[PDB]
């Protein structure tokens, strides 16, 4: 009964890896913005 | 020596650096440290870094230490070892920073990276501001920014003020001085200049371009009004149209309606407006009403 | 000064209240709110444990 | 003797050293030590190091000891045994450091390593700051920094102020003095110089370069305004354009609108602005309004 | 007699010694010993060492004893039996050390080893500091430091101030006086000198080198500002550029904007700045603003 | 720490307004207006810290930092 395989309520991965940031542009500014949405 | 005063070079820009620090050596005019817990917290952090561990439960009431924020400008083409000026501003309930000293302060950029280290003695005027000071050569540059200068054959001169006429004048001056297709105009603010490939050649080209003389064409008529400081400034292009003006406690030097003549140059405008006998605060309302009516042939900007 | 803590079966010593003795007590200068400042006529405040 | 005043040599830089210490010998003007536990804690640490163990439960109320922070500058090419000046600043609720003595203080770098040891007598002016002092030759250098000077055939002169014209002028002067390809320009701030391999040869080259004379080309027009100290400074490149100015309680010496003539040099600008009869605090607002309008042909920087 | 005033010899350096002691013989101006337990603890230690055991439970209220810290300098090539001066500074709540005597005090080094023993009578000025004093020949040297002097054929002269020109001048003077390859320059601060192997020969070489005369080349322009003491010092290399200066309550001797002429030497700079009629505290702000603008062609250092 | 009483006197929360010019390019400088927002008494000798200037689309178009000039 308790050994029957079941699908959990929250399926899939429960964590996400951070994506490394974009390469900064060689313009002489410290402020670098990611691709805006 | 006018092009260097009218434009800026693309990629040659300044950045802003910020940081937190402690200022010591005050004559009992520092933080109260009872309403500013971060002062004592960061002093304990510094002492722990230096090897002294003050027990967590202890009352520390200082008088010669103030928590301050340090601001600096990262110059173009900054190199490590170079020194820059910094501004030191108190953050909470401090009374003065007259003879203080700024301890080791890392100056972070927008990307939260250390670009300079600040440490020095504050100079405070002493009617004068007591909670703000400046340290000349107070910060040493520690990081360098990559740049694209010297790469490619195109560099953009960016005008401080947008003007198609001024852009065309700068383009024509560069073409008159350094060949046919040396400079082209992209918009009212940007002039594209062709330069030889390399670093030294582009420096030579920019050195010749920067000190060039360009005759400034007449700008747009503009009247700047500052109500917070109570000032009015009119440039040389302001003209007037004939119309009648009335305002409280102002009369002909007689009737309350005073004629204002049609004026072509700035001297005529000044004479016509001084004939009104108006205080500058009254002149602000008069000018706004005349702009609404249409006598003032200028752009009225309130700053 | 001892304080009892719940669970602990022994009082915990916090501190000793020390008494100051003067050799001329009348010469103290009364500040007002039940406080006395030492004076050249009542110098040398001697901080001692109470009872000795 | 101008190149040494306009540039700095790459790798020849100064570092900052910080440390904690105790100042003794005060005339009852030290820490209260009831609101500054670290003073008594570090005094007990010093006594324990010297062989005296004060029991942990004991009331120590000192009057001749102050906890201080010591700041110093690590010079270029510093060698052990050399002496440097230090600055001593009180940290909490101390009243004066007039006749104090600084005990053995290790001066740490950014990497938290001891580079100098500080000990000496403080000199305090005595309107004068009482919680800050200076000790000349107060710290002895203990560690030395490795450097790359003498390696390679390239050394960079870094300009204090970025300028393509000044960089080109320095490059041309070096090329005019010491051969064709002796110096090249990399950007508005850096000039690369070719030197012979070795240590003595590079010292000779730098000695010849440093005292060279370079005629300074005209910089950008700039008006510096310090509102905290109430000062205005205008360089020789500032010009004016004709326009009308009005401000509170200022009038023609008459009407509130006063004409300002077109000015080419600095003397004309000074005469035109003095004709206004403006207090420097009023002159600040006037200059900002004129920069907004466009009469002021200069870069207005508030410091 | 200039080389000895411009450089220091490698290995010929001074160290710092510290120690703890008791000062007796005061006229009721010693420690209270109720707020300074270490005074009575160390007095009991001394008595126990001398053969007197005071019972642990006993109230000791002294008036003629003060706990003091003793500082001294270990000279180069110090030998046991030699005497040095010491500084004696009170540590807690003592009133004066006017006629005190310092008992046997071991002076420890950084390595916590005894290098001298201090004992003598204090001299106190008596506006004068009362808690600090000096004892001439107050400490006898007990330990000697090994050194490498006399070994090898190389000795380094270390300049007090870094300068490529001065290093080259010293090298050229030594080469002009004592052969072709007698001295070489390693960096802006160090000059390497070849000496014969041995002790007496190197002493002779250093004796000839030390009193040599070297013409000092002009240094970098520098303006030193001390806000804590209210002083300004300008060296002979400071020049000025023409520009306008305005500051509160300062006017033409007229308008608030005063012209400052281009100045080449120091006398011209002094005349131009004295024409402003500025108090030194006002001169500090004026100089900082002019450095920001660019008129001041000097390095502004706040000390 | 979250539970702590902070009573400051030298800090004021301000709103910064600016104009984005035609054909604006990165690296160019513009003037800004700084206005107090609540119960502050004066901003005579203050300094504006790093302030991102957003547009209508809530995107950063400029960064503001400098010394304020107040008539007084």
Swiss-Prot record, chain A:
Similarity remark: Belongs to the FlgH family.
| Name of the molecule in the record | Flagellar L-ring protein
Question: What does the UniProt function comment say about this protein?
Answer: Assembles around the rod to form the L-ring and probably protects the motor/basal body from shearing forces during rotation.
Q: Which residues of the full protein are shown?
A: 22 to 58 of 232
| Lipid attachment residues per UniProt (S-diacylglycerol cysteine) | 1
Superkingdom of the source species? Bacteria
- Lipid modification (N-palmitoyl cysteine) maps to 1
Coiled-coil parts of chain: none
Quaternary state and partners of this protein? Answer: The basal body constitutes a major portion of the flagellar organelle and consists of four rings (L,P,S, and M) mounted on a central rod.
Q: Where in the cell is it found?
A: Cell outer membrane; Bacterial flagellum basal body
Curated annotation (Swiss-Prot), chains B, D, E:
The answer to keyword Glycoprotein applying to this record is no
Q: Which organism is it from?
A: Salmonella typhimurium (strain LT2 / SGSC1412 / ATCC 700720)
The record's function comment reads: Assembles around the rod to form the L-ring and probably protects the motor/basal body from shearing forces during rotation.
Q: Which domain of life is it from?
A: Bacteria
Q: Which InterPro entries match?
A: Flag_FlgI
**Does Repeat count among this protein's keywords?**
no
Subunit structure comment from the entry: The basal body constitutes a major portion of the flagellar organelle and consists of four rings (L,P,S, and M) mounted on a central rod.
Q: Which UniProt key words apply to this protein?
A: Bacterial flagellum, Periplasm, Signal
Q: Which family does it belong to?
A: Belongs to the FlgI family.
Which BP terms in the Gene Ontology apply to this protein? bacterial-type flagellum-dependent cell motility
Cellular compartments annotated:
Periplasm; Bacterial flagellum basal body
Q: Which GO terms of the cellular component aspect does the record hold?
A: bacterial-type flagellum basal body, distal rod, P ring; outer membrane-bounded periplasmic space
* Protein name (Swiss-Prot/TrEMBL): Flagellar P-ring protein
List GO molecular-function terms, semicolon-separated.
structural molecule activity
Swiss-Prot record, chain C:
Q: Which organism is it from?
A: Salmonella typhimurium (strain LT2 / SGSC1412 / ATCC 700720)
Gene designation per UniProt: flgG
Q: Which family does it belong to?
A: Belongs to the flagella basal body rod proteins family.
Could you tell me what this protein is called? Answer: Flagellar basal-body rod protein FlgG
What are the annotated disulfide bridges? Answer: none
Localization in the cell: Bacterial flagellum basal body
Quaternary structure and interacting proteins, as annotated: The basal body constitutes a major portion of the flagellar organelle and consists of four rings (L,P,S, and M) mounted on a central rod. The rod consists of about 26 subunits of FlgG in the distal portion, and FlgB, FlgC and FlgF are thought to build up the proximal portion of the rod with about 6 subunits each.
Span covered, complete protein: 157 to 208 of 260
Write down the superkingdom of origin. Bacteria
């Amino acid at each position: 009964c308790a050994w029957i395989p079941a699908k959990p309520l929250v399926q899939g991965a429960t964590t996400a890896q951070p994506i490394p940031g974009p390469v900064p542009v060689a313009n002489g500014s410290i402020f670098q913005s990611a691709q805006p949405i | 020596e006018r092009i260097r005063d009218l434009t800026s070079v693309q990629g040659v820009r300044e950045n802003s650096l910020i940081g937190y620090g402690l200022v010591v050596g005050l004559d009992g005019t520092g933080d109260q440290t009872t309403q500013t817990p971060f002062t004592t917290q960061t002093l304990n952090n510094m002492l722990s870094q230096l090897g002294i561990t003050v027990p967590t439960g202890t009352n520390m009431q200082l008088k010669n230490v103030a928590a301050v924020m340090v601001t600096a400008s990262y110059p173009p083409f900054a190199r490590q070892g170079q020194t820059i000026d910094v501004v030191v501003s108190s953050m909470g309930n401090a009374k003065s920073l007259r003879g203080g000293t700024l301890l080791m302060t890392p100056l972070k950029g927008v990307d939260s990276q250390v670009y300079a280290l600040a440490q020095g003695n504050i100079l405070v005027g002493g009617v004068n501001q007591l909670n703000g000071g400046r340290i000349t050569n107070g910060a040493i540059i520690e990081r360098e920014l990559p740049t694209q200068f010297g790469a490619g054959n195109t560099i953009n001169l960016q005008l401080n003020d947008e003007d198609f006429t001024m852009a065309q004048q700068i383009t024509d001056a560069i073409n008159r001085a350094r060949g046919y297709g040396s400079a082209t105009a992209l918009d009212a603010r940007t002039v594209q200049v062709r330069v030889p490939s390399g670093n030294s050649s582009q420096v030579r080209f920019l050195a010749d371009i920067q000190n060039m003389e360009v005759n400034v064409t007449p700008q747009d008529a503009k009247v700047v009004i500052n109500s917070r400081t109570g000032s009015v400034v009119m440039n040389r292009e302001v003209t007037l149209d004939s119309c009648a003006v009335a305002q409280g406690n102002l009369s002909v030097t007689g009737g309350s309606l005073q004629s204002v003549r049609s004026s072509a140059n700035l001297n005529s405008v000044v004479r016509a407006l001084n004939a009104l006998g108006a205080t500058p605060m009254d002149l602000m309302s008069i000018l706004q009403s005349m702009q609404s009516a249409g006598c003032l042939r200028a752009k009225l900007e309130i700053i | 000064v001892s304080v009892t803590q719940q669970g602990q079966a022994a009082p915990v010593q916090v501190g000793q209240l020390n008494l100051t003795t003067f050799m001329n007590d009348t010469g103290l200068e009364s500040i007002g709110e039940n406080l006395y400042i030492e004076t050249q006529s009542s110098g040398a405040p001697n901080e001692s444990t109470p009872g000795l």
